[PDB]
């Protein structure tokens, strides 16, 4: 059934979202006393990617 197929695809997406949320929670709870941020991580996530998504870190 198309309804069953659509529900199956949604469940796959939600499992992927669970994995992604686990990764994001791991990233969020990081401090300079336990992890060191590589320069590439900086130049990507704090400069380039936010611009594409219209986020413009205040950087006050």
């Amino acid at each position: 059934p198309l309804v069953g197929k659509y529900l199956m695809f949604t469940m796959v997406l939600v499992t992927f979202s669970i994995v992604t949320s686990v990764c994001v929670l791991n990233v969020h709870h990081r401090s300079p006393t336990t992890h060191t941020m590589a320069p590439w991580v900086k130049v990507v996530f704090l400069e380039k990617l936010p611009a594409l998504l219209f986020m413009q870190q205040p950087r006050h």
Binding site: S31, P32, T33, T34, H35, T36
Partner: protein, 51 residues
């Protein structure tokens, strides 16, 4: 895993962060162990029937 070389003056916050890192390391031991077991167990349980 390379812990950042941070010299935290407070011996009470540093010890906590030492504990917080000891907890993190223990997780990474089992994350590696369980990943291996799951893959080996699944492949070690369903591969022979297929072949």
């Amino acid at each position: 895993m390379k812990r950042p070389s941070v010299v935290d003056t407070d011996f009470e916050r540093s010890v906590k962060e030492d504990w917080k890192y000891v907890a993190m390391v223990i997780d990474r031991i089992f994350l590696w162990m369980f990943i291996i077991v799951c893959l080996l167990g699944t492949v070690g349980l369903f591969l022979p029937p297929w072949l």
